[PDB]
């Protein structure tokens, strides 16, 4: 009985195995644009991804994964309302089964078709492993997508899909450029999270993009063929494998613009 999306094993079910599920600084949240506040505080972002480099591609049976090799100074994340340099890991997405859902944060109570999400991890820390276990170990860049004109970008992710199909899959990705998935403004909200599936860990500072990037009815449509489910198993549509907004609690919204 492994944690899922489904109506038994899906978001409400999850504190039982990981407590921190009602903790005080989960995620994801809804943006209230008209409560979150400008901080001038906050420093430029920068955003280095030219010399990124990726190296797989993974089906983990909640979304797909694309693994970059962080074992040196590439692909970082720094400036805002980061202290130091976070490293690029991986990136994945949450999509629903229609394009009326499957982002995670929302923006005044609005979901988009699907939400990106760059996660990095603070240098400072050695690893993914130890950072995990830091109230400042991860920052997560995430990015919204809406169904309109196609992501160029993008396509070279879709078509690989196809030979993750199911859970446990995994193939040769590399030379993926992730600069080709950033929208042209980095206006965007911060505040202090977590990850939005389990474990749930409280080590996630956010940055969420303003403006979301434009896919395709059939890219997205792609996305949707992936399976939950792994390979000889019954099938089971990878799709809403979104976590619903949780309470704010505690925590004010910062906006860079
Ligand atoms: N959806 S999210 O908040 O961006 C997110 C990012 C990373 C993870 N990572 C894990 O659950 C994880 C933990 C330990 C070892 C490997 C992984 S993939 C989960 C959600
Ligand atoms: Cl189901
Ligand atoms: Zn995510």
């Given at each position: 009985h492994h944690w899922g999306y489904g109506?038994?094993n ?48 993974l089906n983990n049976g909640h979304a797909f994964n ?95 899909l196809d030979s993750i199909k199911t859970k446990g899959k995994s193939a ?53 063929k992936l399976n939950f489910n792994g390979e000889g198993e019954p099938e089971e549509l990878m799709?809403?494998n ?16």
């Open positions: 109506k038994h899906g978001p409400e079910h999850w504190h039982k195995d990981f407590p921190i599920a009602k903790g005080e600084r989960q995620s994801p949240v809804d943006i209230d644009t008209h409560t979150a506040k400008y901080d001038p505080s906050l420093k430029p972002l920068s955003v280095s991804y030219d010399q990124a480099t990726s190296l797989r591609i694309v693994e970059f090799d962080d074992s040196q100074d590439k692909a970082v994340l720094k400036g805002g309302p980061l202290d130091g340099t976070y490293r690029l890991i991986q990136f994945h997405f949450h999509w629903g089964s229609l394009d009326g859902q499957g982002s995670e944060h929302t923006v005044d109570k609005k979901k988009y078709a699907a939400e990106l999400h760059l996660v990095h991890w603070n240098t400072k820390y050695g690893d993914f492993g130890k950072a995990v276990q830091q109230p400042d170990g991860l920052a997560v860049l995430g990015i919204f997508l809406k169904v309109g004109s196609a992501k160029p970008g993008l396509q070279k992710v879709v078509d690989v040769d990705f590399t030379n993926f450029d992730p600069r080709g998935l950033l929208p042209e403004s980095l206006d965007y909200w911060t505040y202090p999270g977590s990850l939005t599936t389990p474990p749930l860990l409280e080590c996630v500072t956010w940055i969420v993009l303003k403006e979301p990037i434009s896919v395709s009815s059939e890219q997205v449509l792609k996305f949707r799709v809403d979104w976590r619903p907004a949780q309470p704010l609690k505690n925590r004010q919204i910062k906006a860079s613009f």
